[PDB]
């Protein structure tokens with residue numbers, strides 16, 4: 541119960557239903573490191589599917605029922621035993637209550653049943669934290685999992701530009717995108733439920749007034765900004781350092797690809813499909829120097845209490861992140877930052893989560 545809720549003082553920056561957005565904070569007075577973590581949880585892209593999400597996933601659309609505290613876990617833990625990487629940092633958990641992959645900039649109005657303000661929520665959290673110690677930061681790591689990991693890719697350079705324009709050019713902004721690196725590939729079977737992410741994101745952008753990083757927007761241009769939600773397309777346009785964590789066989793990727801493993805022998809077509817998915821993922825990370833990509837069927841990593849357990853080539857994620865920090869002070873002896881499994885099937889890495 542170590543991170544305490546603060547609702548935004550600017551109450552025009554809202555969750556989907558117009559309730560104020562907010563953040564959970566645990567300060568560390570002896571540290572100039574700040575970790576701002578973006579929660580995930582899919583998205584919604586029209587009135588009917590947002591109404592459904594409001595009925596049964598309301599905490600992802602509203603702050604009315606948020607608890608006063610949350611426990612920091614994994615990379616948000618303040619215990620070195622659980623978080624060898626950044627246990628002494630100032631910790632911020634930003635709840636995902638905008639259902640827009642952190643991309644929205646639209647208020648609730650007579651024309652809009654819901655507000656989609658994810659990009660503005662991040663901006664406002666950063667602004668309000670500057671008065672609570674962030675002005676003294678040396679590193680701001682914008683991290684996130686699942687839709688929050690894609691949110692990191694969409695927002696890390698905007699945070700960097702915001703701090704520069706506010707007069708804090710000494711704060712180094714970096715990104716950590718966990719489980720948010722998706723492929724716009726062919727589904728295994730081509731069957732809201734039938735809508736593939738490219739089409740759902742294309743509709744969502746219009747519904748949310750979604751915004752993407754400027755250089756990526758300039759490449760893809762009007763009507764094609766959905767491309768910027770796909771890591772391998774947006775990442776090369778980014779200027780801030782970004783560390784990419786991605787399971788090679790991510791469960792959300794497989795879900796959108798209409799792959800459902802049961803227990804029966806996988807036949808040749810599905811075997812080749814899965815192997816090609818891992819190969820394609822691995823290919824997209826070849827030129828990503830800071831990356832951690834284990835050959836596991838799983839979903840998210842960084843806020844799980846046992847996040848320390850998985851290893852790629854004998855190196856854990858907390859160690860790789862520590863090596864990344866050292867690299868941003870060429871490669872370091874025994875301290876690697878590019879860790880992508882090459883084995884071709886889920887759980888060929890023995891350290892995968894059970």
Ligand SMILES: Cc1sc2c(c1Cl)[C@H](SCC(=O)O)NCN2
Pocket residue numbers: 580581582583641685686687688690722737741769770792793796
């Ligand atoms: C831009 C894209 S493509 C895609 C996603 C997003 Cl976001 C979701 S998010 C999943 C979650 O939050 O658990 N997973 C599947 N495919």
Ligand SMILES: *[C@@H]1O[C@H](CO)[C@@H](O)[C@H](O)[C@H]1NC(C)=O
Pocket residue numbers: 550552553660
């Ligand atoms: C509150 O947030 C809105 C939306 O980002 C912004 O336009 C406005 O200037 C903010 N007001 C204050 C006082 O920060």
